[PDB]
Amino acid sequence: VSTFPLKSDINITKSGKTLLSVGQGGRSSRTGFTATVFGGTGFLGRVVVSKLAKHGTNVVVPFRNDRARRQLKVNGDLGVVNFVEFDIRNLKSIEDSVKYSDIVINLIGTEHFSKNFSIEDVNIGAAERIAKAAKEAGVSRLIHVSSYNANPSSSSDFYATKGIGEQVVRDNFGPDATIVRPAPMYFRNSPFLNELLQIKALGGNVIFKKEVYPVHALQVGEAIERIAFDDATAGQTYELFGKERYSKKELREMIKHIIHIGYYPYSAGFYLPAPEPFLYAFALIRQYISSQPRFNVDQLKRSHINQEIDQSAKTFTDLGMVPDELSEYLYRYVKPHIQNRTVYSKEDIEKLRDYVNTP
Amino acid sequence: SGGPVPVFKKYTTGSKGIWEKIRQLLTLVPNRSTGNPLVKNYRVPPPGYYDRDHRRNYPRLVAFDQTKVSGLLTLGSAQNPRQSVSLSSTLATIDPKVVKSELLAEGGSPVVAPSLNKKMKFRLTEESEHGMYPEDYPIRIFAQN
Amino acid sequence: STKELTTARIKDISKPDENNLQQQAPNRISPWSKSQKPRAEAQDNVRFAVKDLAKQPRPYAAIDLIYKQPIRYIEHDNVAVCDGNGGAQGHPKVYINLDQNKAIPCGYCGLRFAQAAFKEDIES
Amino acid sequence: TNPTAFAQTTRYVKDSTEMRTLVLNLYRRYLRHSRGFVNNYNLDIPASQVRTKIRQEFERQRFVKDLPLKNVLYMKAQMEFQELVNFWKQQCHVMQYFESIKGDSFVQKFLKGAQ
Amino acid sequence: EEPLPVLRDLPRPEYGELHAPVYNPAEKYKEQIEELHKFGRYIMGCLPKFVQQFSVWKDELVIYVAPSALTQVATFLKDHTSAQFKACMDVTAADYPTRTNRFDVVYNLLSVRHNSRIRIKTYASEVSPVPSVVPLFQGANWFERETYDLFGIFFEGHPDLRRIMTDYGFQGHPLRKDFPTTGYTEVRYDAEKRRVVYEPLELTQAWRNFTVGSSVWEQVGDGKDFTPESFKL
Amino acid sequence: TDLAKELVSGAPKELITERVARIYQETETWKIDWDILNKGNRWENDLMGYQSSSDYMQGTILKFDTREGAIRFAKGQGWDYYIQEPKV
Numbered sequence A: 001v002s003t004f005p006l007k008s009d010i011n012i013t014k015s016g017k018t019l020l021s022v023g024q025g026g027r028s029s030r031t032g033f034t035a036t037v038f039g040g041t042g043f044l045g046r047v048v049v050s051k052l053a054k055h056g057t058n059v060v061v062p063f064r065n066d067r068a069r070r071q072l073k074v075n076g077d078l079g080v081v082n083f084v085e086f087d088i089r090n091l092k093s094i095e096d097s098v099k100y101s102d103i104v105i106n107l108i109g110t111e112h113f114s115k116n117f118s119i120e121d122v123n124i125g126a127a128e129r130i131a132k133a134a135k136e137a138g139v140s141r142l143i144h145v146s147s148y149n150a151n152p153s154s155s156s157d158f159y160a161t162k163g164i165g166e167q168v169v170r171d172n173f174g175p176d177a178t179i180v181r182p183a184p185m186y187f188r189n190s191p192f193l194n195e196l197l198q199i200k201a202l203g204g205n206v207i208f209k210k211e212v213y214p215v216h217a218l219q220v221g222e223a224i225e226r227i228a229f230d231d232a233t234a235g236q237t238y239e240l241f242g243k244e245r246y247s248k249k250e251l252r253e254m255i256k257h258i259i260h261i262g263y264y265p266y267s268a269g270f271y272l273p274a275p276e277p278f279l280y281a282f283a284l285i286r287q288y289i290s291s292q293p294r295f296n297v298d299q300l301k302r303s304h305i306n307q308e309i310d311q312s313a314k315t316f317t318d319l320g321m322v323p324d325e326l327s328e329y330l331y332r333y334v335k336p337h338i339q340n341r342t343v344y345s346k347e348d349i350e351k352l353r354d355y356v357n358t359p
Numbered sequence B: 001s002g003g004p005v006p007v008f009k010k011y012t013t014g015s016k017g018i019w020e021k022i023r024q025l026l027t028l029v030p031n032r033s034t035g036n037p038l039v040k041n042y043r044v045p046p047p048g049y050y051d052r053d054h055r056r057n058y059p060r061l062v063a064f065d066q067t068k069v070s071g072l073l074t075l076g077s078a079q080n081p082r083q084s085v086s087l088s089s090t091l092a093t094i095d096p097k098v099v100k101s102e103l104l105a106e107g108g109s110p111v112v113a114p115s116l117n118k119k120m121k122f123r124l125t126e127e128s129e130h131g132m133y134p135e136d137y138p139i140r141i142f143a144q145n
Numbered sequence C: 001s002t003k004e005l006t007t008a009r010i011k012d013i014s015k016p017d018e019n020n021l022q023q024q025a026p027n028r029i030s031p032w033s034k035s036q037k038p039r040a041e042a043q044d045n046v047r048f049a050v051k052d053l054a055k056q057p058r059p060y061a062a063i064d065l066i067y068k069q070p071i072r073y074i075e076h077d078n079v080a081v082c083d084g085n086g087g088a089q090g091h092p093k094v095y096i097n098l099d100q101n102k103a104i105p106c107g108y109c110g111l112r113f114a115q116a117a118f119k120e121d122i123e124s
Numbered sequence D: 001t002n003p004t005a006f007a008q009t010t011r012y013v014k015d016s017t018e019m020r021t022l023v024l025n026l027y028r029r030y031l032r033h034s035r036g037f038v039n040n041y042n043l044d045i046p047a048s049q050v051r052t053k054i055r056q057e058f059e060r061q062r063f064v065k066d067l068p069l070k071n072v073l074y075m076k077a078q079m080e081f082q083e084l085v086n087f088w089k090q091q092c093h094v095m096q097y098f099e100s101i102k103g104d105s106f107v108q109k110f111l112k113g114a115q
Numbered sequence E: 001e002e003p004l005p006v007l008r009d010l011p012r013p014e015y016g017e018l019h020a021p022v023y024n025p026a027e028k029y030k031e032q033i034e035e036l037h038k039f040g041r042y043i044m045g046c047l048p049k050f051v052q053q054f055s056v057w058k059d060e061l062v063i064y065v066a067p068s069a070l071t072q073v074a075t076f077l078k079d080h081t082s083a084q085f086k087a088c089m090d091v092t093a094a095d096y097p098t099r100t101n102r103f104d105v106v107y108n109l110l111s112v113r114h115n116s117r118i119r120i121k122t123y124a125s126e127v128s129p130v131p132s133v134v135p136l137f138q139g140a141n142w143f144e145r146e147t148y149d150l151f152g153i154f155f156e157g158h159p160d161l162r163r164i165m166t167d168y169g170f171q172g173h174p175l176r177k178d179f180p181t182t183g184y185t186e187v188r189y190d191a192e193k194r195r196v197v198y199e200p201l202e203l204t205q206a207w208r209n210f211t212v213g214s215s216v217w218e219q220v221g222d223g224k225d226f227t228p229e230s231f232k233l
Numbered sequence F: 001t002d003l004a005k006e007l008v009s010g011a012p013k014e015l016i017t018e019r020v021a022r023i024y025q026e027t028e029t030w031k032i033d034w035d036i037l038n039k040g041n042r043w044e045n046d047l048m049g050y051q052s053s054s055d056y057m058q059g060t061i062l063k064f065d066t067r068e069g070a071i072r073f074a075k076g077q078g079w080d081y082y083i084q085e086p087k088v
């Protein structure tokens, strides 16, 4: 960001287009690109879209929810943010969002299968159609986002399909495609944190014993931004994660202690020891009775699997960015949910973390 | 004079038939109209060089400072003749009989601030004249006399 | 055909079509100004992807509706007076000297004139 | 008419020494309200951080010399105190006040466009 | 019980030739200019020490004093029964960068008693303070704050002077001549920060300047004098 | 002249250093305006061809009366400047 994102004013894409950026990088400036951000209306998209538009890149955001795309237009200027109605089952609408696009970003990825899509149909079927269709329109660069633990042979549906999503893209878009693996990001209304703040978290012991490498969502938002303007980063695999290792159960008590939540945790439902069959049965029952995406069977297995760093991939420093730690930002993102306010600074998170580990 | 006026002299929707006599029995003031305009008359047909120059002769901009101010009392006037020349010394040594005609008016009496309009003279009016509130109401009506 | 659509011309070699949405106007293909951006180029933008081209504003080109109009003629005089041909809601009155031997357009309306003698010569 | 909280008369101070003591008390007034500024505006930075930024603000411009321009700098800094203590600036302005902010070689500026 | 008329059908006059008189409007001020000149001379008579000069344009009287002599003259113009200017209507200013004291602080006064207005004009610099007229008129408490906010003029003795027309934390005083008409910054909403943030100015369309094709010739000359002969050498 | 008035005018830091003001004479008075930016003074907007700009001093011109009066102002504000002598 700073004042101007582009490294050089004139950039030539892989397709021979010669794009000249104008202006000093303000709202009324431009960069001559057209970055189609699939799944832009999601949690991750609203950061990817926001950074691209403010610096003058045209953003084509294909949406399926009409009332969620309205707020994305504030970020850009007049004509900067464009909208296309689409569904992954409508091939023609896909080709409307890639015809004029020089950058194509893929963010579509689900954890719960619905009555219209399975986990494979989205992490693969959407990705395969999106990647292959983009190539036929002469898209210069493709960027993809997968799980942080992609594995073709994993028994977890999410990790198995996300891994195959990496293969099927590279057999469709080709060598130019890029794959970026984000660690669980934390931000306002982050799905990673929304499970920790929920008071009635059945199976809290089982769900929160998993391990992670939390990463600030803004940096990943800029991580795609750095990759977008550069052609040197084609055909790579990137895994983005935070230095200091944290576990959900370590966070859950750390989160609760900041909110100061005697008898209350024992009664309101903070700790709900429930049998393993009951958790498996409850998730299956809601899967046919619920109407909103609930806790899934897949996240019962993932809770037993810890995050794995892959050494074949490249870190933040490969892009010149130093990742930020959850300690410097965990307090502010739960500040909404918390005499004299005690602000738990960066260093003081350890002293909180110390208080959790002490029996 | 804006006295009371009947309903049939106001361009408004009226009452036709016995309803007129019903209206004149129930309504507190029978000479008030409903306010709806007359559709048959109101908006019925729709709307479908030097001798004459003064700006160049605008009054000039002349400033009078202490130097020129002193000159009127000593030399006199361009109608009735009689560098840094300070006024304060002139007021210290000059004939008061110059003051009582030049610097002051009507035998040294101070000049009342010039009225922006002399003919602003007021008189207090009464209820039977202006048809406004009676006396107990806490206002009074003034006129130009 | 990617050649006349992006070039300015006096007239059009091909006969235009009202139903071609790539032309500059329904009644003319090539643009009538050197700096005017061809319509085919403009519609190749990001914001025309899902917007229907049929409903976009395509007013008929001005440079044709005038040249359809037959040239006015003047008999036994060499000064042409034109003031909009509509009364007092027109352009300011202008006098056109007819000494030159061709069709001289009006200042504002674009109407062309002639003389009695040169009626046969100018029409050639 | 009744003047508002934390008001002072606008006076053209004609002493070099008196202005020195007026400023010193003023700097303490900011530090006294360090806890409040955090709680009032819900700033993400702790109390010690605000004092650190306030000190960076006061250290920055201590070397001015013109007395006629000393009073002006003391007058407007009083307004900044009065606006902040009375809780007049919106939350966003204070957050961005502390969120503001090494150069690059000529090749780096030549390529992208410089200024 | 009579039918209402129809006004369109009423008979109307017919008017033909028009003789609209064209004479100098300054003639109706012939006495007014005469009355005001004496009054300004009278004030200089009552205040030789402070009234530097004065001038009368039609039916308006101007008094020019130094910043030191401001409150002294305004107190005289308030209390002295010959000139009871009780209400201070306006406290304005303007910028003329050429002179050392660029600003020109104005004081319009109203005399309900004697039915006249006066104009005390005292200069001010970017640093030279001006005494506050609050001890005389409490009605300038808000007219001075506007002048300070839009000019930066330092008013000496104001009970509480601060921003009244600009945004909180605004930088610069706008009505100056060197201050650009578009400002230095403009705001927008940044979703990532989740707040409305200031940002450096950017215009999609810059303010086109059409003053270049201004007049190159003279427009107005000296004019015609109307000074009453009693105020000439 | 010796006064650092830039701390009271509220102008941004860039006016003191990175901008140059010309004191010219168009036929009886002098004017001050700022020289154009290196880049970003005028770029064609890609939507409607509007003449965009990031320079905020493009539309500013100050009408002075005398040369020394203009020079006094430029020194007072701490402005870098140069003077263009008209041809006789």
Ligand SMILES: NC(=O)C1=CN([C@@H]2O[C@H](COP(=O)(O)OP(=O)(O)OC[C@H]3O[C@@H](n4cnc5c(N)ncnc54)[C@H](OP(=O)(O)O)[C@@H]3O)[C@@H](O)[C@H]2O)C=CC1
Pocket (backbone or CB within 6 Å): A038, A039, A040, A041, A042, A043, A044, A045, A063, A064, A065, A068, A087, A088, A107, A108, A109, A110, A111, A117, A122, A145, A146, A147, A148, A182, A183, A184, A185, A186, A190, A191, A192
């Ligand atoms: N910190 C995080 O959030 C995590 C990041 N990831 C992965 O990163 C990627 C980014 O997703 P994220 O934004 O973070 O979370 P979301 O689940 O909110 O992103 C989902 C986006 O993809 C769209 N989407 C999902 N299914 C479909 C479908 N059948 N058809 C069309 N669109 C669909 C959604 O559309 P819409 O919302 O409009 O209905 C939305 O735009 C995901 O794959 C995620 O699993 C990995 C672990 C956690």
Ligand SMILES: [Zn+2]
Pocket (backbone or CB within 6 Å): C082, C083, C084, C085, C091, C106, C107, C108, C109, C110, C111
């Ligand atoms: Zn004509």
